[PDB]
């Protein structure tokens, strides 16, 4: 049974489309404006190709929420629906989201992290579309990819966390709060959603993920953008 | 209503399969034959991995037209149809097509261009399969990704256009004619097709795109191949 | 007609899931344990990102066999089925499998090989789902991508085969046995399967591919892992 207030859901996706997409434009605008807090046009005249990955993720997520809003405003399951198959839209975004984080701190094993998150979400896509007791077999399989990934990421994050200056360490701390505080919120919501326990309705499931996407991609991207400016402002602008 | 002359459409796709695929084989054959117009086997003994991207695109496009011809010769919607979902086959080709162009001129923001064209086509895939007034919402969303992408590409193209010698500038000019003259022809055909205004029938839509693919991938790849030979013939063969 | 012993098929996939996935964990564990047979933590403190590709392939394949086992244990076609569309799961694995092999021997034209195997499998996906005489048109199209790919790979393999020391040449020989002895076994099984000649039943088709995947990904990955240790033990551990 899925008979929910679509105009409300479409409005929320439309509002999130503007902010997430608009947030991405600022990141790209701010990236190609100066090496750090100054207006230095880099040594080579352009930023490295990976620094723009944070901005593109929000634009990619913002575009998806534009399509989600069209799906809800239509009033049901559109033929090109980005809401019917849960977590399918996140397959194209989360692997890049961890990849952007990995490049920012030059964490090791970027390829391992990419497939860790790439396969974590595909287990979510399979779990959602499975109307049987094996829904949680995929969920358990997905967690087997996430738990080693989360724990290993914490270990490497702390390795890089104590080497940054305190001024630049402030932004990394809040990036970790979003990464290690909200990413594990998606599996928790899956357990309690209508798929699992049943406490959270389908409509409330969409709204909560709308705000989670505002946090994990838009706000997280802003912190990465601000972190990157400070990181380059201490090394390549001050020589330290 | 889709009851069109499939043997004609299959023949056209079959003919385009041979030329596009055959054109790709020449590019690969010509690439691994000499640094420029001579038979110099490069300094490292092999061409860089990206120079072969132009040839692979035609082979990838040629393979797709082999599958399209099988779909039409079958006489309708084959289970593995590359014609039922319009613009879906272009999702795997156009992003590489811009990527090959970006590497040829070492344009900045290659990652931004890739996702600009990657998301431009996905809006086309959604627009086609949407039997409602929101077809043009996806179309408008797709154009929001294409118009900044086209205009920005023109700005960077002209930046690199005035630094090449006139001999090598001739080939770049015609590459721009195809890129800035025919890529915007796809959205124009969408408006006038049976999806939009209704002037162009579905059958004529397939035929026109068959010739557009001959131009944007096969002929465009040839110009890139000839451009690349001249570009390397002026710098690494003459020292200028 | 597909009414086969699913508990047997689920058990085989479950057993292959444990070994293939478990084999991948050893590769990753062994990779990040020493430059060669010693415990040298590399010069830069971490292995290159591509050395871990062999381990990830088995984990990716092992995860897929976890999903295949869930599909069979369910007792038919699960909504998220990795068995309904034959060769679709191999699209994400084989291109990386050749890519891992190409990086191990630093073979040229890695991009050409990737699309050669990527498009070879997509022809298999189309061939399987085509209930007409054009099934073998896709099969023939797929072989047109595989035969040049196989023959070219043999030529480049032998080029790199005579330059390695005999101690390290032993492992390369068996890698070639799997690559040039079992990869062409998949098209042969397609001809004789229920899709083609009809000698091999659908159930026996799953079991044989279960053992082929144990060989082409798990055992092949082990040989690559052992080969890589020896290759680095002769150059960067002995200076030769
Ligand atoms: C736009 C920017 C996007 C950027 C990145 C995109 C990448 C992600 C790709 C998204 C894939 C979209 C698939 C969504 C399928 C939705 C199916 C659906 O809605 O089904 C339910 C719905 C039933 O609902 P009603 O009939 O209203 O029931 C009430 C009774 N009156 O069924 C339908 O409408 C039938 C669906 C028609 C066919 C679906 C076509 C999907 C579009 C195909 C293009 C996508 C290509 C995917 C690649 C593999 C090829 C399948
Ligand atoms: C070969 C080289 C290709 C290289 C790169 C390929 C990448 C692009 C992938 C292409 C995806 C292909 C999807 C096409 C689906 C076509 C559906 C279709 O034709 O439906 C219409 C047709 C109705 O027509 P008729 O019955 O003739 O009506 C007249 C009444 N007598 O419906 C059918 O035939 C039923 C369709 C059967 C199921 C479709 C199976 C599609 C193949 C699956 C493999 C693709 C995997 C995609 C990944 C996501 C998983 C879905
Ligand atoms: C888990 C780790 C995986 C890692 C990597 C994954 C990448 C590969 C992606 C795999 C795509 C999976 C597609 C499988 C579709 C299977 C369709 C199927 O089983 O149909 C047959 C079956 C008929 O059988 P029964 O009714 O039992 O008949 C007997 C009568 N009692 O039909 C059904 O069950 C209906 C199918 C429901 C819809 C299918 C939904 C597929 C899941 C969608 C997510 C995948 C996204 C793909 C991207 C493009 C969007 C389509
Ligand atoms: C079926 C679902 C599949 C969805 C999975 C999504 C996973 C996304 C896959 C990869 C995302 C792309 C990011 C890859 C890393 C970017 C390359 C990198 O690290 O930089 C190397 C280097 C950076 O330059 P430097 O050496 O600093 O230059 C200094 C000048 N002397 O590269 C360059 O030179 C620039 C060119 C890099 C490649 C251009 C971008 C191509 C990326 C491919 C995107 C693939 C996306 C697949 C689908 C997306 C769906 C969301
Ligand atoms: C769901 C729909 C998804 C479809 C989206 C399609 C987007 C395509 C994604 C990426 C396409 C691949 C091109 C990426 C750029 C290639 C790498 C590059 O720029 O070169 C770096 C560098 C080049 O060498 P140099 O440093 O010059 O060596 C000198 C020797 N001392 O790399 C190398 O060393 C060679 C190895 C490069 C990687 C090999 C190719 C792997 C590419 C992955 C393809 C991904 C395709 C995804 C699906 C395709 C569908 C059409
Ligand atoms: C629709 C079906 C599509 C499925 C097709 C599957 C094809 C898979 C596409 C690409 C697979 C990823 C492998 C690409 C090659 C990896 C990059 C590489 O060669 O290394 C370059 C270089 C290695 O470092 P060095 O320069 O040695 O550093 C020394 C320190 N001074 O790169 C790095 O620095 C590390 C970062 C590399 C990128 C991180 C990984 C991102 C890869 C994208 C994966 C895309 C997968 C797409 C879907 C997968 C489905 C199975
Ligand atoms: C619990 C309430 C949640 C509210 C939601 C948040 C909404 C967005 C607001 C920003 C959230 C993230 C901010 C992270 C912290 C950075 C702010 C900051 O101060 O940054 C500066 C500089 O960096 C910045 O400018 C970052 C802030 C810019 C954020 C811009 C907002 C996002 C862009 C959206 C525009 C388009 C949206 C469309 C309208 C919305 C319609 C619904 C860094 O230096 P300071 O510590 O000030 O030191 C001063 C000396 N250097
Ligand atoms: C409006 C009419 C459109 C006609 C369609 C076009 C069909 C293909 C013909 C070529 C079109 C693109 C040519 C672009 C310009 C390059 C031609 C050229 O002259 O190139 C040379 C050299 O480069 C070349 O050789 C490029 C031309 C080679 C093109 C080969 C054709 C494509 C391969 C197809 C073979 C297989 C097709 C199967 C048969 C078809 C069955 C239907 C560059 O130097 P020049 O200016 O001559 O200076 C001389 C001193 N250096
Ligand atoms: C026809 C029978 C087929 C049997 C199936 C094979 C099962 C797996 C057994 C290994 C097969 C591949 C082995 C390849 C050859 C390497 C073995 C070897 O000797 O390696 C050493 C060292 O390298 C190794 O250790 C490689 C072997 C390690 C393989 C570990 C097995 C795979 C991991 C699976 C664990 C988890 C599985 C879960 C349980 C299964 C439940 C069903 C290299 O040096 P040597 O020539 O011994 O010289 C000695 C002085 N240097
Ligand atoms: C309450 C919700 C939102 C967040 C729950 C997770 C919080 C408590 C987690 C997420 C990120 C974590 C931080 C990540 C990194 C470090 C650096 C280390 O050297 C000290 C601990 C410290 C500072 C962690 C403290 C705990 C932390 C803040
Ligand atoms: C009529 C159709 C096919 C093409 C329409 C677009 C044509 C007119 C466009 C496409 C590419 C464009 C060229 C692209 C780059 C340059 C370099 C610049 O320094 C002068 C203008 C010039 C030379 C442009 C002239 C206009 C041009 C030729
Ligand atoms: C293109 C070049 C490299 C040859 C590779 C394709 C060859 C091996 C393919 C092309 C067409 C194929 C044949 C087409 C149809 C059938 C009917 C089937 O009931 C049995 C197999 C059989 C007889 C196939 C065997 C393999 C075959 C001959
Ligand atoms: C019987 C099945 C399993 C395998 C059939 C293919 C076998 C015979 C093939 C696969 C790999 C091949 C080897 C690959 C590379 C070389 C190096 C070359 O300098 C001499 C031949 C030699 C040693 C080949 C001999 C034949 C070989 C072993
Ligand atoms: C912007 C969205 C982000 C960063 C989403 C992240 C989502 C996850 C890490 C989801 C993980 C899941 C599991 C751990 C197991 C079950 C399936 C999921 C998808 C809910
Ligand atoms: C070989 C084929 C090529 C280069 C195709 C390019 C296609 C486009 C740039 C299509 C663009 C579209 C829009 C701008 C908006 C609406 C949807 C499209 C797909 C028609
Ligand atoms: C682990 C699995 C591997 C390495 C599988 C490899 C499969 C192939 C090389 C399959 C090739 C095919 C053809 C040559 C043509 C017809 C279709 C295939 C898929 C059976
Ligand atoms: Na995390
Ligand atoms: Na353009
Ligand atoms: Na092979």
Residue numbers in the entry:
A (entry chain A), B (entry chain A), C (entry chain A): 17 to 256
The authors write:
Kalium channelrhodopsin 1 from Hyphochytrium catenoides (HcKCR1) is a light-gated channel used for optogenetic silencing of mammalian neurons. The genome of H. catenoides also encodes a highly homologous cation channelrhodopsin (HcCCR), a Na+ channel with >100-fold larger Na+ to K+ permeability ratio. Here, we use cryo-electron microscopy to determine atomic structures of these two channels embedded in peptidiscs to elucidate structural foundations of their dramatically different cation selectivity. Together with structure-guided mutagenesis, we show that K+ versus Na+ selectivity is determined at two distinct sites on the putative ion conduction pathway: in a patch of critical residues in the intracellular segment (Leu69/Phe69, Ile73/Ser73 and Asp116) and within a cluster of aromatic residues in the extracellular segment (primarily, Trp102 and Tyr222).
In that regard, HcKCR1 is of particular interest as a highly efficient tool for optical neuronal silencing. The central pore between the three HcKCR1 protomers is filled with six phospholipids, which we modeled as dioleoylphosphatidylethanolamine (DOPE), three in each leaflet of the bilayer, that prevent ions from translocating through the pore. In the HcKCR1 structure, the presence of Ile73 and Leu69 on the helical interface between TM2 and 3 moves TM2 away by 1.4 Å (measured at the Cα atom of Val66). This helical movement slightly enlarges the vestibule, which may help accommodate a large K+ ion in the vicinity. In HcKCR1 Tyr222 forms H-bonds to Trp102 and Gln218. As a result, the extracellular channel opening is interrupted with the bulky aromatic Tyr side chain in HcKCR1 but continues deeper into the molecule in HcCCR, creating a key determinant for K+ selectivity. When the channel opens under illumination, Tyr222 (likely assisted by Phe221 and His225 on the other side of the putative conduction cation pathway) allows K+ passage but functions as a barrier to the flux of larger hydrated cations like Na+ and divalent cations.
